[PDB]
Amino acid sequence: MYLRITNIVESSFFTKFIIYLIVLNGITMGLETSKTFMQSFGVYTTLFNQIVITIFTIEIILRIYVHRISFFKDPWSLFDFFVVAISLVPTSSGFEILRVLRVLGLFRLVTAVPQMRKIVSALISVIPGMLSVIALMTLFFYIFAIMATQLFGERFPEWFGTLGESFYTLFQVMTLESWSMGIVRPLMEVYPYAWVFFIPFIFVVTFVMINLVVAICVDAM
Amino acid sequence: MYLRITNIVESSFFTKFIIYLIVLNGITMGLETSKTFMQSFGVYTTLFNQIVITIFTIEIILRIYVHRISFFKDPWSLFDFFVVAISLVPTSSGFEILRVLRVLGLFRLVTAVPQMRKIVSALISVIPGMLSVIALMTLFFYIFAIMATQLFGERFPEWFGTLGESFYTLFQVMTLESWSMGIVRPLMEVYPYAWVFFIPFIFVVTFVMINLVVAICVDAM
Amino acid sequence: MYLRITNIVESSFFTKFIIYLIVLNGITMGLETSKTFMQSFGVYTTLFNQIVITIFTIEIILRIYVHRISFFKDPWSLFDFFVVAISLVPTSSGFEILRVLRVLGLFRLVTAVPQMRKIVSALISVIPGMLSVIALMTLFFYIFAIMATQLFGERFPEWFGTLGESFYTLFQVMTLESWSMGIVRPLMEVYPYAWVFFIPFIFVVTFVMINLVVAICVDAM
Amino acid sequence: MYLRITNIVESSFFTKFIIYLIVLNGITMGLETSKTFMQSFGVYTTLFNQIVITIFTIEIILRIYVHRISFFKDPWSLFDFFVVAISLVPTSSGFEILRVLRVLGLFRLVTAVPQMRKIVSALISVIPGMLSVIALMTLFFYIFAIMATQLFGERFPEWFGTLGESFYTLFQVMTLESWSMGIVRPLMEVYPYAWVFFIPFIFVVTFVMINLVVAICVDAM
Ligand SMILES: C[C@H](CCC(N)=O)[C@H]1CC[C@H]2[C@@H]3[C@H](O)C[C@@H]4C[C@H](O)C=C[C@]4(C)[C@H]3C[C@H](O)[C@]12C
């Protein structure tokens, strides 16, 4: 009977149908946002969603028997699996965080549809030749986040009171958002040489970013 | 009589004269801005504009007989047509929006003048090899917009209360404008882990943008 | 006697001496900033500056006789000439604007020193292959500045009340500084669809900028 | 006895052990941040750090005898030396700044570990072909900083009252952070033409930055 199901799963119909449900589920997730829609089609959608998750679980089971070990060595299948699994965890209990993670299922449209797979794949394959720089950077933040914490945390708890608060603030400085009016001008009211810390940090972190980008451009060419 | 008009329309004079009116109309559209100018040359300009639109309709009609079906398969002509048409719709009625859309007529100067066409044409030809990434991105926003709405909309109606309000805010976050001081720092006063939603969102949306640009550079070569 | 001066002007000494004065003048311009310095070396510097301008005028005269027509066909000499001329206009009269323009003389260090000339020259030579895009852009701002003025000027005079105010505000939007929190969120309190005007404007103006940069990168390669 | 130590220092063990201490020291420097941790493991950590600095000084001494003059002509060793030296300066006296500079020791992890060296080395090698543009820029800031001081310092002491205050503000304008809402819009309330100073400054400083980046991309190829 193995081959009987394999010619179902491997069919065009099967894929087209799933892709069809992804888009339907996606559309319905956005309608589930409208307070108006939910007082009308309230029960309608509550059932429609328990229906779709069933079809998807069936799909992932069928896909598993047709593929066995190959299934759990496909990044895309694993994504489909974990995403369907999250959706399976009961609507209540623990925190509601899981209920929100459901909408990550709509990334199945990247899985189920080729060409989408293609771009995601092209985008991701660029990451490996970055990890040496990403590591350098992370070490860099960590060194500066520790300095910032012990230089500015006492008088500026909100922004630098904690290693993590300093990571957060430095990230903001890196994105250059309000770094002068919001952070360094206030800081200099107490610590007039604070600029000696932040101008260099901005130069280095900016410089590295520019190189990181150059990398990706020259290497693709 | 066909050829009699065709040697008019196709002449050097004809185009030079239209290009002349474009610039004349354009200049006059900026003077129609001055509150001072309109209390003086008020009626003067009101007539000058009704004249120009006539010459332009004549122009588009003459251009149609000389070109027939070819006219309506030329992007530039279609633009010229639709732009003259918007201008034809009566000054009153409906909304005043149309009255504003008239100034889009000055993009004719891109049509009537070569070299302008050339650049616009080059800029546009880059769009096709982007639609997959633009598509990816749009899906991405949509997934994150739906999550933000159900995670932050209750306590932050202005920014996340609505799927579209969430779209707008996320776009702003993408441009990185006030994203920490204006949005995430306030958000964290209620949801201390909000950063888990926005730092990743920023990385992904930035990363993709950086690639989107790389694309255009290497591919142009 | 022509050759007598030509072997002065064309000497290394001559150039080295002028470059020496540029740097001295430059240093002294920054000291002329200190309120402390000016109550001490007040008269000292007032004379030192009238001295330097004399030596420079002599220099530009000597350079002219050794070069005649070639002098006024050298961009660099013309700069040196006009910059020395501005410095010659009496300290008083008209407005003080001229007194400030003096410090532009320190760009003589770009003239008098090669290698500096080289970079300025490389940087400028990139401009010609941009004017078609710069023109497109300027037309673009002009069309949108006029729309913004007649759409938002009434209720938002400070930002959009004038064609120029609209140019200014749109430039700010283009640099993406406070565009949402500072301009478009306030605007939407009155005009809820204002986003239909600014999101497109941001896309187009951003898109063009990215291409403008691609241009310069691919063309150099 | 020379070779006896040389086969220690040059061993795989030696480096692995140092790299181990770097990471151990590094981790412990972040725990020294927790107010909680220090009331518990207070004395524990105070000793652990005096131990590590000893091992590191021994390390740098052993490395010196095995390398002598070659040691002091290796950038990385010089760094390791100066970084260990800063750490040697007593916890008290002068300012506490030195105590903070200790954490710069964690950049050793870049030294002791290859591949890190590799990236840092690649990033740095790009700097030489920039110094002409960095030089141009610095001259540029200096010229505009002096002008801003004498044009805006009187009525705007905080932002332009001082050559250095002007440098800082102009850098902020260069990063484009709050430049219109925070600086030029306020400035124009007194000096309606201030925009003539800042829009050009922004164009030039942006233009140069765009070229600076182009440089690194084409030249890397
Ligand atoms: C195309 C129209 C007439 C239409 C026709 N059928 O001939 C031409 C009539 C006069 C021409 C301008 C001028 O001559 C030379 C300029 C310099 C350079 O060339 C770049 C562009 C020019 C502005 C140019 C633009 C365009 O070309 C026209 C408007």
Q: Technique behind this structure?
A: X-ray
Tell me if C119 and D132 make a contact (CB, 8 A cut-off).
yes
Which residues constitute the domain of residue B215? 115-221
Same domain (yes/no): A155, A60 = no
Rounded Cα gap, residues C5 and C58, in angstroms: 12
Q: What is the stated resolution of the deposited model, in angstroms?
A: 2.9
In DSSP notation, D78-145 reads HHHHHHHHHHHS-SSSS-THHHHHGGGGGGHHHHHSTTHHHHHHHHHHTSGGGHHHHHHHHHHHHHHH
Answer yes or no: are the C-beta atoms of B151 and B197 closer than 8 Å: yes
Answer yes or no: are the C-beta atoms of D89 and D29 closer than 8 Å: no
Rounded Cα gap, residues D88 and D105, in angstroms: 11
Rounded Cα gap, residues C183 and D35, in angstroms: 43
Binding site membership of A for Ca(2+): which residues?
Answer: 175, 178
Report helix, strand and coil shares of chain A as percent, to nearest 5: 80, 0, 20
Same domain (yes/no): B88, B119 = no
Residues of D in contact with A211 (CB under 8 A): 122-123, 126, 216
Same domain (yes/no): D109, D120 = no
Mutate to test the interface with A, among B172, B178, B211 (most CBs of A within 10 A): B211
Rounded Cα gap, residues C145 and A96, in angstroms: 47
**Nearest CA distance, D212 vs chain A (angstrom):** 10
Tell me if D146 and C103 make a contact (CB, 8 A cut-off).
yes
State in Å: Cα B22 to ligand 1 middle: 14
Please give the biggest Cα pair distance in chain B: 79
Same domain (yes/no): B91, B148 = no
Binding site membership of B for Ca(2+): which residues?
Answer: 175, 178
Tell me if D107 and A181 make a contact (CB, 8 A cut-off).
no
State in Å: Cα C153 to ligand 1 middle: 36
Rounded Cα gap, residues B77 and B71, in angstroms: 6
Handedness of CA D55, D56, D59, D61 (dihedral sign): negative
Which residue, among A79, A85, A66, A59, has the nearest Cα to A121 in the 3D structure? Answer: A79
Angle, alpha carbons D89-D94-D98 (nearest 5°): 45
**Nearest CA distance, D166 vs chain A (angstrom):** 13
The Cα-based distances of B202 to A67, C26, C221 in angstroms read 36, 44, 31
Chain length of chain D: 221
Is C189 in a helix, a strand, or coil?
Answer: coil
Query: Which one-letter DSSP state was computed for residue C14?
Result: H
DSSP H helical segments within C102-176, as ranges? 108-112, 116-124, 131-152, 157-160, 163-174
Report the nearest-CA residue for atom 2 of ligand 1: B16
**Nearest CA distance, C104 vs chain D (angstrom):** 7
Which residue, among C51, C77, C53, has the nearest Cα to C63 in the 3D structure? Answer: C77
Q: For residue B212, what is the enclosing H or E element?
A: helix B195-220
Chains that touch B (3 or more CB pairs under 8 A): A, C
**Integer Rg of chain D from CA:** 25
Tell me if D178 and A181 make a contact (CB, 8 A cut-off).
yes
Binding site membership of C for sn-glycerol 3-phosphate: which residues?
Answer: 30, 34, 162-164
Both ends of chain D: CA-CA distance in Å? 49
**Cβ-Cβ contacts under 8 Å for A137 (sequence gap 6 or more):** A205, A208
- Tell me, what amino acid is at B200? P
- Tell me, what amino acid is at B23? V
Rounded Cα gap, residues D4 and D9, in angstroms: 9
Report the nearest-CA residue for atom 8 of ligand 1: B16
Q: Which of D92, D114, D136 is the last residue of a domain?
A: D114
Rounded Cα gap, residues D179 and D206, in angstroms: 13
**Which candidate from D147, D176, D210 shows the least CB-CB separation from C103?**
D147
Give the chain C residue whose CA is nearest to the CA of B126.
Answer: C211
Rounded Cα gap, residues C21 and C59, in angstroms: 11
Same domain (yes/no): C106, C133 = no
Chains that touch A (3 or more CB pairs under 8 A): B, D
State in Å: Cα B115 to ligand 1 middle: 9
The Cα-based distances of D12 to A146, D67, D79, D112 in angstroms read 31, 17, 21, 12
Q: Which two tokens stand for residue C147?
A: 């729309």
Same domain (yes/no): B13, B33 = yes
Residue environment code for D117-136, b if the CB has 16+ CB neighbours within 10 A, otherwise e: eebbeebeebeeeeebbebb
Is the CB of residue B23 below 6 angstroms from any atom belonging to ligand 1? no
Same domain (yes/no): C81, C16 = yes
Same domain (yes/no): B132, B99 = no
B interface with A, Cβ–Cβ below 8 Å: 132-133, 135-136, 139, 142-143, 146-147, 149-151, 162-163, 176-181, 195, 199, 202, 207-208, 210-211, 214, 217-218, 221
Which residue, among B177, B181, B187, has the nearest Cα to B151 in the 3D structure? Answer: B187
**Which candidate from A30, A119, A122 shows the least CB-CB separation from B163?**
A30
Q: Which two tokens stand for residue C51?
A: 């001295």
**Integer Rg of chain A from CA:** 25
**Nearest CA distance, D119 vs chain C (angstrom):** 24
Q: For D217, phi and psi rounded to 5 degrees? A: -75, -50
**Cβ-Cβ contacts under 8 Å for D21 (sequence gap 6 or more):** D52, D55, D56
State in Å: Cα B114 to ligand 1 middle: 8
Q: Which of D87, D114, D141 is the last residue of a domain?
A: D114
**Cβ-Cβ contacts under 8 Å for A102 (sequence gap 6 or more):** A29, A86, A87
Same domain (yes/no): C88, C106 = yes
**Which candidate from B30, B213, B216 shows the least CB-CB separation from C146?**
B30
**Nearest CA distance, C131 vs chain B (angstrom):** 10
Tell me if D210 and C216 make a contact (CB, 8 A cut-off).
yes
Answer yes or no: are the C-beta atoms of C15 and C8 closer than 8 Å: no
Residues of B in contact with A120 (CB under 8 A): 136
The total number of structural domains in chain C stands at: 2
State in Å: Cα D54 to ligand 1 middle: 79
Same domain (yes/no): A43, A136 = no
Per the rule left: phi > 0, alpha: psi between -120 and 50, beta: everything else, A115 is left
Report the nearest-CA residue for atom 23 of ligand 1: B113
Rounded Cα gap, residues A22 and A108, in angstroms: 7
Q: For C33, phi and psi rounded to 5 degrees? A: -85, -35
Same domain (yes/no): C65, C122 = no
Same domain (yes/no): D86, D183 = no
Angle of helix A131-152 versus helix D116-125 axis, rounded to 10: 90
Q: Which of D114, D143, D177 is the last residue of a domain?
A: D114
Which residue, among D177, D164, D115, D167, has the nearest Cα to D141 in the 3D structure? Answer: D167
Angle of helix D195-220 versus helix D163-174 axis, rounded to 10: 60
Angle, alpha carbons A211-A213-A219 (nearest 5°): 95
Answer yes or no: are the C-beta atoms of D23 and D107 closer than 8 Å: no
In DSSP notation, D36-78 reads HHHHHSHHHHHHHHHHHHHHHHHHHHHHHHHHGGGGGG-HHHH
Residues of B in contact with A26 (CB under 8 A): 142
Per the rule left: phi > 0, alpha: psi between -120 and 50, beta: everything else, C162 is beta
The number of the ligand 1 atom at minimal distance from the alpha carbon of B11 is 6
Q: For D77, phi and psi rounded to 5 degrees? A: -75, -45
